[PDB]
Design a protein around this ligand. Structure first.
Ligand SMILES: [Cl-]
Ligand SMILES: [Zn+2]
Length: 487
């Protein structure tokens, strides 16, 4: 009764369709079955209480994270594990039945979320590194025999260009175990959450909200979240939603379908890579990020907002020198929306930046402090928020999505002037003086040290053409000196 493609293939003929969730009406017993896997399934069905949940599901294609990023001019650090199954695969040989693919590329992901450094290895210096290791198995239409060496939650990788059009692909983990998952968009409640954790067969529970996906250990979810899984997911959704709102993605119907992943790791306190945000699986860190109130406080809120803001910061607001500047517009907004302190206020940044840049008569580009560069960007928001344009950044980011050019490396300085034009046009305000005082219009050749090093050439013509363009609009000047705004 071995689970060979020939034994399994013969058995497939006994079920009503390729889902194998029901038997042909003349199949009364299991005497004709050739495979252990399909016989065991048919025995469940014949006994009248088969639960296909999770084990069998149909998977919808998502836009690739890189397409999503390109469309919005932002990063592609969205979840590769978005199509969670709620299926856990024990060590052994598994049978996975895939429906019609129409040649679509589709694979199975088995990440090692519980990977730890070897005994006596310093976690930060792990020779295996800090990345999320996984087995990736290409799937074909039909019978897939998959050898699992270490037990794993399963995730489907199914991404295309034109996701609304691609087929739904059925996948049946015949030999799997239903770990389940928590999904607030499905209507799951705290009752569901407690039951999920109590009956979990994996050390990892998968959960998602509107925008967040989390992959955290059951032990920490029970210890700290306990009861409040809905609140936890809502809190991460609030943090991400704050960025989408500031981006104007809600206003203009452009919230991406892709989730952002926050995961456990066993190497380091907190970091972000291409897979998303990672948090150390110890009591200290897990208390901060698996408790729904703690995740919205101070350092936890800032750290998450700061990192996600690297995915969400758009290229036209993130020219050279701006990598650690434009993402913190999100951090400041998230602090304002969660009742936390202003870090610009706490650092005395308005004063530090006015002294460094305005009094120092340097170019904005030459500023040596990423909080000082953040100051005018935040003053604009605080000003326009009070003076009749509450959708300031939402409209500016939409305008730049639609109108900004396409620049890389040393050419990215052109975005500085495009950003200035966008702010004027959106608000119908002549902001020449504000930007002049903050040194946006200083000509020269500037060498700027970000992660990359930039050589910007701001010519007198570039400055004059921007100023001419603004003057030509005939907008009113603000009544007050916006550079004087402080908290
Ligand atoms: Cl920071
Ligand atoms: Zn950063």
């Amino acid at each position: 009764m071995a689970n060979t493609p020939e034994h399994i293939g013969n058995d497939l003929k006994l079920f009503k369709d390729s889902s194998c969730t029901s038997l042909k009406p003349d199949v009364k017993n299991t005497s004709a079955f050739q495979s252990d896997a399909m016989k065991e399934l048919a025995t469940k069905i014949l006994a009248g209480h088969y639960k296909p949940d999770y084990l069998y599901a149909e998977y919808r294609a998502l836009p690739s994270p890189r397409q999503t990023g390109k469309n919005l001019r932002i990063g592609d650090g969205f979840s590769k594990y978005d199509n969670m199954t709620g299926v856990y695969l024990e060590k052994g040989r598994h049978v996975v039945l895939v429906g019609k693919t129409e040649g679509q590329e589709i694979s199975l992901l088995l990440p090692n979320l519980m990977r730890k450094p070897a005994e006596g290895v310093q976690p930060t210096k792990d020779p295996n590194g800090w990345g999320l290791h996984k087995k990736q198995i290409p799937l074909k239409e039909g019978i897939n025999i998959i050898d699992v060496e270490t037990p794993a939650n399963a995730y489907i990788s199914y991404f295309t260009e034109d996701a609304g059009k691609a087929p739904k692909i059925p996948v049946h983990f015949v030999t799997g175990k239903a770990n389940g998952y928590f999904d607030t968009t499905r209507g799951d409640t705290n009752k569901d959450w407690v039951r999920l954790l109590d009956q979990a067969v994996s050390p990892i529970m998968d959960a998602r909200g509107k925008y967040i996906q989390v992959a955290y250990p059951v032990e920490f979810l029970k210890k700290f979240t306990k009861d409040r899984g809905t609140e936890l997911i809502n809190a991460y959704d609030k943090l991400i939603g704050i960025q989408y709102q500031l981006m104007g993605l809600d206003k203009y119907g452009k919230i991406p379908e892709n989730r952002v992943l926050a995961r456990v790791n066993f190497n380091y306190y907190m970091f972000r890579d291409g897979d998303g945000v990672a948090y150390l699986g110890n009591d200290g860190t897990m208390r901060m990020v698996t408790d729904p109130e703690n995740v919205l406080k101070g350092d936890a809120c800032w750290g998450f907002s700061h990192e996600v803001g690297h995915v969400m910061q758009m290229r036209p607001m993130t020219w050279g020198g701006m990598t650690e500047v434009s993402n913190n517009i999100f951090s400041l907004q998230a602090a304002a929306k969660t009742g936390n302190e202003s870090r610009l206020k706490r650092q005395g940044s308005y004063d530090k930046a006015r002294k460094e840049i305005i009094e120092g008569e340097i170019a904005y580009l030459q500023s040596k402090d990423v909080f000082n560069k953040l100051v005018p960007l935040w003053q604009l928001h605080l000003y326009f928020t009070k003076n009749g344009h509450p959708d300031f950044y939402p409209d500016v980011m939409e305008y730049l999505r639609n109108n900004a050019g396409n620049y890389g490396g040393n050419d990215t300085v052109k975005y500085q002037f495009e950003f200035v034009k966008a702010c004027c046009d959106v608000t119908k305000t002549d902001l020449t003086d504000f930007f002049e005082k903050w040194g946006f219009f200083k000509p020269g050749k500037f060498h700027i040290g970000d992660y990359a090093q930039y050589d910007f050439n701001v010519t007198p013509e570039m400055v004059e053409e921007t100023k001419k363009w603004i003057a030509g609009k005939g907008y009113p000047k603000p009544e007050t000196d916006i550079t004087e705004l402080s908290e």
